[PDB]
Amino acid sequence: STKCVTIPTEMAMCNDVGYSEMRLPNLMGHTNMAEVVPKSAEWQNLLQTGCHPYARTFLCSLFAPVCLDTFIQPCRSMCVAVRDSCAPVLACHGHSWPESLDCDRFPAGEDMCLDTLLPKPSCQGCPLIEEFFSHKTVLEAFCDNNFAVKVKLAEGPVEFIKQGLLLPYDTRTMIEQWLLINENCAQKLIRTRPTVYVIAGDIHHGKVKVNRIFHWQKKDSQLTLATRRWRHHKC
């Protein structure tokens, strides 16, 4: 038996994707909502990393499929595109792309399947949290990297030192995505109490890479001096 049931608000994967009802069993083989919801919740961290714009579409088509008796599967090429961008993020959390989503289970081509007609943080080594630095070294970091920001983590409102093309909202989100991906690094940084850092990095093509992190301590002089002189500094 197959039934059409409303997507409950507690299913964060799919509670705001445009349609409101789903098929049981779903394409994952879950038979009831007590199974669907916690299994879907395993993906909540991943979906917040922004690793692929179609990640949520892809997963909802499997977890909350539309109410036909025919299964409309994602096309293999959609699985491959989402896997290739998001499996590196899973690996950064100690997880792997599940065998239940190996892309060979989905049809090749584009008939009867779901297909497609900003800079991304990557999993990287943790930057040293620098503490005994001179303002000269900070300024050289500002010259080299194409952005630098002052942020407070606990992650409050961000002050640009070297802004470039960056928009404030986008930069905030890029930082939070970097912290969510790089869980091991976040844990060293967000050692409560709330802490202030200067973060210098590079938005290459088209990835974000954090290269330098400077701890802004209570009675700092060197980051103060560096941020004051940056405006008039010559590289």
Residue numbers in the entry: 24 to 140, 151 to 187, 201 to 281
Task: Tell me what the authors wrote about this structure, in their words.
Sizzled (Szl) is both a secreted frizzled related protein (sFRP) and a naturally occurring inhibitor of the zinc metalloproteinase bone morphogenetic protein-1 (BMP-1), a key regulator of extracellular matrix assembly and growth factor activation. In most vertebrates (with the exception of mammals) this gradient is finely tuned by the presence of the protein Sizzled (Szl) which is a potent and specific inhibitor of BTPs (Ki = 1.5 nM). Bone morphogenetic protein-1 (BMP-1, EC 3.4.24.19) is a secreted multidomain Zn-metallopeptidase of the astacin M12A subfamily which plays a key role in extracellular matrix (ECM) deposition, growth factor activation and the generation of animal form. As a member of the BMP-1/tolloid-like family (BTPs), BMP-1 controls ECM deposition by site-specific proteolysis of procollagens, proteoglycans, prolysyl oxidases and other matrix proteins; BTPs also control growth factor activity, particularly members of the TGF-β superfamily, by proteolytic cleavage of precursor forms or growth factor antagonists.
Crystals from native and selenomethionine-labelled Szl belonged to space groups P212121 and P21 and diffracted X-rays to 1.95 and 3.32 Å, respectively. The crystal structure was determined by combining SAD phasing using the Szl-SeMet data with a partial molecular replacement model from the high-resolution native data (1.95 Å) and refinement to the same resolution. The final refined model includes two chains (A and B) containing 235 and 241 amino acids, respectively. The structural fold of Szl is stabilized by eight disulphide bonds (seven intra-domain formed by cysteines 27–90, 37–83, 74–109, 98–136, 102–126, 159–231, 176–281 and one inter-domain formed by cysteines 115–156). No electron density was observed for the linker (residues 138–150) connecting the CRD to the NTR domain, probably due to high flexibility. Instead, there was a rotation about the long axis of one domain with respect to the other of approximately 90°, pivoting around the inter-domain disulphide bridge.
